[PDB]
Amino acid sequence: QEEISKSKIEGGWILLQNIQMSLSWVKTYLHKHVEEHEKFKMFMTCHLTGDKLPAPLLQRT
Amino acid sequence: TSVKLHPNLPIVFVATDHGKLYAFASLQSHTKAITSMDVLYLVIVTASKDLQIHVFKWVSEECKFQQIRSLL
Amino acid sequence: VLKWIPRNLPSCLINVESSVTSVKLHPNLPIVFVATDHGKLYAFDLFNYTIPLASLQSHTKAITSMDVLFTNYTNNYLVIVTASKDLQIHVFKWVSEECKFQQIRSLLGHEHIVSAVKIWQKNNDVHIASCSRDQTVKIWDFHNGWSLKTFQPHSQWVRSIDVLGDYIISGSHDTTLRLTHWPSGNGLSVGTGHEFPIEKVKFIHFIEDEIRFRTPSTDRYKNWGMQYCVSASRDRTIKIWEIPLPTAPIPNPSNFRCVLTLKGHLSWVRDISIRGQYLFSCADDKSVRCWDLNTGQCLHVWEKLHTGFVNCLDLDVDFDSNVTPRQMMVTGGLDCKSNVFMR
Amino acid sequence: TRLVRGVYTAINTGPRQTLRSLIRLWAYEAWRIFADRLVGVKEKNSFEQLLYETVDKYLPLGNISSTSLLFSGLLSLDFKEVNKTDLVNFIEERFKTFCDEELEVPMVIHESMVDHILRIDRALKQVQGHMMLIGASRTGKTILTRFVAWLNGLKIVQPKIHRHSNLSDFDMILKKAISDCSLKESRTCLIIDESNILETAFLERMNTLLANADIPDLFQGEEYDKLLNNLRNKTRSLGLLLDTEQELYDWFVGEIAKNLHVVFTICDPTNNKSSAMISSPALFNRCIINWMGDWDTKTMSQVANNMVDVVPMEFTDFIVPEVNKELVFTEPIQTIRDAVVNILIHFDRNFYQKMKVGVNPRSPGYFIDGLRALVKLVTAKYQDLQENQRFVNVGLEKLNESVLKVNEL
Amino acid sequence: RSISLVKSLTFEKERWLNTTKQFSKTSQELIGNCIISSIYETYFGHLNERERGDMLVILKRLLGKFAVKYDVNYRFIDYLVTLDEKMKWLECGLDKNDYFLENMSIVMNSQDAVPFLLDPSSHMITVISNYYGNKTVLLSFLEEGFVKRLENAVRFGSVVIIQDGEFFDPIISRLISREFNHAGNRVTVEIGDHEVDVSGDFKLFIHSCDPSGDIPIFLRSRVRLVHFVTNKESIETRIFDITLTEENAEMQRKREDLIKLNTEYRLKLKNLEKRLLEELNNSELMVTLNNLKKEAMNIEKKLSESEEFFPQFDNLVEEYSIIGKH
Ligand SMILES: Nc1ncnc2c1ncn2[C@@H]1O[C@H](COP(=O)(O)OP(=O)(O)O)[C@@H](O)[C@H]1O
Helix, strand or coil, X not given: CHHHHHHHHHCCCEXXXXXXXXXXXXXXXXXXXXXXXXXXXXXXECCCCCCCCCHHHHHCC | CCEEECCCCCCEEEECCCCXXXXXXXXXXXXXXXXXXEECXXXXXXXXXXXXXXXXXXXXXXXXXXXXXXXX | CCCCCCCCCCCEEEECCCCCXXXXXXXXXXXXXXXXXXXXXXXEECXXXXXXXXXXXXCCCCEEEEEXXXXXXXXXXXEEEEEECCCEEEEEEEECCCCEEEEEEEEECCCCCEEEEEEXXXXXXXXXXXXXXXXXXXXXXXXXXXXXXXXXXXXXXXXXXXXXXXEEEEEECCCCEEEEECXXXXXEXXXXXXXXXXXXXXXXXXXXXXCCCCCCCCHHHHHHXXXXXXXXXXXXXXXXEECCCCCCCCCCCCEXXXXXXXXXXXXXXXXXXXXXXXXXXXXXXXXXXXXXXXCCCECCCEECCCCCCEEEXXXXXCCCCCCCXXXXXXXXXXXXXXXXXXX | CHHHHHHHHHHHCCCCCCHHHHHHHHHHHHXXXXXXXXXXXXXXXXXXXXXXXXXXXXXXXXXXXXXXXXXXXXXXXXXXXXXXXXXXXXXXXXXXXHHHHCCCCCCCCCHHHHHHHHHHHXXXXXXXXXXXXXXXXXXXXXXXXXXXXXXXXXXXXXXXXXXXXXXXXXXXXXXXXXXXXXXXXXXEEEEEECCCCCCHHHHHHHHHHHHCCCCCCCCCCXXXXXXXXXXXXXXXXXXXXXXCHHHHHHHHHHHHHHCEEEEEEECCCCCHHHHHHHCCHHHHHHEEEEECCCCCHHHXXXXXXXXXXXXXXXXXXXXXXXXXXXXXXXXXXXXHHHHHHHHHHHHHHHHHHHCCCCCCCCCCHHHHHHHHHHHHHHHHHHHHHHHHHHHHHHHHHHHHHHHHHHHHC | CXXXXXXXXXXXXXXXXXXXXXXXXXXXXXXXXXXXXXXXXXXXXXXXXXHHHHHHHHHHHHHHHCCCCCCCCCCHHHHCCCHHHHHHHHHHCCCCCHHHHHHHXXXXXXXXXXXXXXXXXXXXXXXXXXXHHHHEEEEECCCCCHHHHHHHHHHHCCEEEEECHHHCCHHHHHHHHCCCEEECCEEEEEECCEEEEECXXXXXXXXXXXXXXXXXXXXXXXXXXXXXCCCHHHHHHHHHHHHHHHHCHHHHHHHHHHHHXXXXXXXXXXXXXXXXXXXXXXXCHHHHHXXXXXXXXXXXXXXXXXXXXXXXXXXXXXXXXXXXXX
């Protein structure tokens, strides 16, 4: 959370590895963040055989 | 057109020549002129020149007029 | 003249637009006032009941209570007050010349609907008592038209009050009766014993004409002037209560006492009345009873007096010397028909 | 044993009984004990025939249907059989008073809901009498429970359970309710919904409350000592000579048992947590299972007729269609009102069949919403049509009058 | 002037006579049309076009079985969606789709039940935000302080849209179930642990951009669940609009301005006819009616002149039909 805020303010890439291990955080914080800098890109690495990621987050990326 | 009164209430049911019905609740039951009306819950039957008779019941709880059925 | 009992059948019927809530009698002229759930106020002659004398709609909601009074002075008209659910209390004037209703003023300040009002004369001054769902027992002067006292004596909302002298009592939704001194605004004793909200509570009055509950017991109670109270609730019971002697009265360390408990109604008891040794009460079982205070039993039962529920009834006040206790009885019902007993 | 206790209660609180009245009362008790848990209509008919056979072969009498037996102590001072129309009128007046006093809700009274009111009142008048209402959503479970508890003078306690809530808040509200039942001797009707059981530990707490008459977890240590002191002070105020811990706690348990009724509201009994709630060991053996189910077509016809009879509906000709008796759910068709009600019932059944609800109970919310929308829409449309037609007619009359005046001049 | 007044009202007299003739036919089919309208209102909020058509066929069969008359050319948009409401919805940002128009009319004519919006694209949030202007407020079930913000909004009277409908918070149940206690002229509702007042101008919307989520049975049985799912004709129209904007932006601007002017002129003509009827009913006046008739003739001539660009639009549609279908 702190690094996402810092990277949105001052710029910089960021990658979240294994987002399926924190599904509650993905369903609340990530949804409310992607729902609402220029050199800021965020990557998420999940698994095809894992749990179902939320649809509103998935279509926004 | 026609003048009617309640049996034991201080209400006068006066019918206009344009088809409106007034109680002194207003409702234009008849589009054309109304010939005559009769009284008899209280059942009021209105006849007009449009070959259609509408029977209305006067509800005294809310002082409104409700239609039960009509004869054509 | 006091032991009158109404006949088996009614003499005549009064037709009202909707359900009747309160009915009052003029002490002098044989004319009856009928309330209406639609908000209208009626006035029917006891002899010519085909058409009302006067009818007006001063309120926009249901009228809850009314009571009349013939004003007297030591130096003279009829004052009628109307309580309704429209947040306002309307005071009317009944002129006896042309027999029409004349609105005097409106009293505002209640935070919810008002359900009971009381009017009495003392030292050539007329006061209007009131109790509402705002849990406040308020009083408004008839001439000044300004509030005098206001207090919150019940946890729940008050439903009916009655005034004897400078003392007031009140029954509310929490099944308690509170006797509070009006000039000081403090409670004197509490009430417990009911399991359903009070519909009507009124003081019993001493008479000199032998009724058990209308005679004082000791000299201290004779000086106080009040000893018992009658309360009717939704428990299908009528209970005669007892007031302990208080020490600006100071409450003695504070509980009432049920001297006698009546029963026999098949539904909620709505309104009660007193005339001599007989107690007249109506209920939602479309029936009216008649209880003796000396025996506690019911002599006569008026089965199926109204098609629907029976809301209100009253008799002529016999404790007051200024009002002649005529044998006039009139009841109000939910079936849009008022019933009056003649001779 | 429940049947025997019910028969004793009805005889004790009843008038002078005859043999026919005794048989009818026993049949009513049999209906309330053995046949409130039945789901299908054919099982209800089978139970009715079983009662007929048993009565005819052991006690050699009117109709013994579920609705034809209306026993209630509301209309009198004693538990006796009452008529249908006067009971409906009394319930109408008291529900009008209830809507005036507590909350306004536009509900329309039919015979099946009168029967449900009677059985809920019978179950709430008992000692250790708990209910468990099962039926589709918007059938009227919680509002009927609140109305019946208001009739009996009970105090409604509905737990304010929402998301981000744990066992602490549920234990706090349960302890507060128990304190009101015992220390303040106020009668309480605690209504627990299916959605108020967020976790299975809530169900365990309810199970402990129902099996015993208290939760041993809610009074442990310092709070146990506080409960001891408070109830000792209450007993001193009441005026009973209790000093030992055992007798005082038995008084506590007896007061809770006398002054606490729990009513369960369940929408879909197929869900996992609802199935666990139904199949709970001491919820089954203590509660009175009352399966309301979905609305049968007679109830829908009655409520539809009672909500469309007030609108101006019949204004034109109508030919009576030649349709089968199985396709007519109302009375035989005489006006367009019965045809409208039958059309709405048919569309509700066909829509719920097409959506493949399966055996899940059918919510009558769509039926009521469509009825209210149709009433308001036909009122507005009729008003607009008659106003427009009057305007066009007077305009044409004015034009013709002007033309005639110009021709005369 | 009276002679010209009589002569100019020949078309008005003919239209009035035709409407008087068809009044009996429209009154015969009023009940069936109202029944189908209520069925649309309370049943087909959560159905796609195929299911809507199939259940409409079933409803028409069941309506004709009991021999009650209904309009054979009935249409929901022409019966419930008025021209002023349609203009407001299209100006606020609603799509040109008939499905979206039907769902819009379903949502904004539900004055009793709380409308539940299921819009994956999150377009109705900004459509309703444009509809109510600056008095709207956006809340969510997933944010802290939601309870006090909703209480303040109910006290003030603002229009509230609650996002994330699949995370329903059950202390607004009395707001959902419309179980209010009337206190004289004031209406109060108990939310949470303390009652709040209702201003009477407060409207509630629930939005959820997650299809196949989780709606509780208490919430599901008491809301007008309305599904905003994109369909074939919406895709075709959006593809055509995008390719025409990127191909000839000036022509696309001209066509949309022409469409807006044409519908504004039609609304003005309808309002002018209504004003003429009202003025003639409330019967100087001849000069005013002559001016109104001159304005109506000007509007009709404007439409006749503006109807000369339709073949180009039709040719472009026929050209890009293959791109749309692909
Ligand atoms: N007999 C009835 N007549 C009319 N409406 C009813 C009736 N019974 C239930 N309702 C509807 O159901 C709603 C209340 O149902 P409720 O008791 O909340 O259902 P549940 O207990 O499943 O939540 C009311 O809004 C009312 O419109």
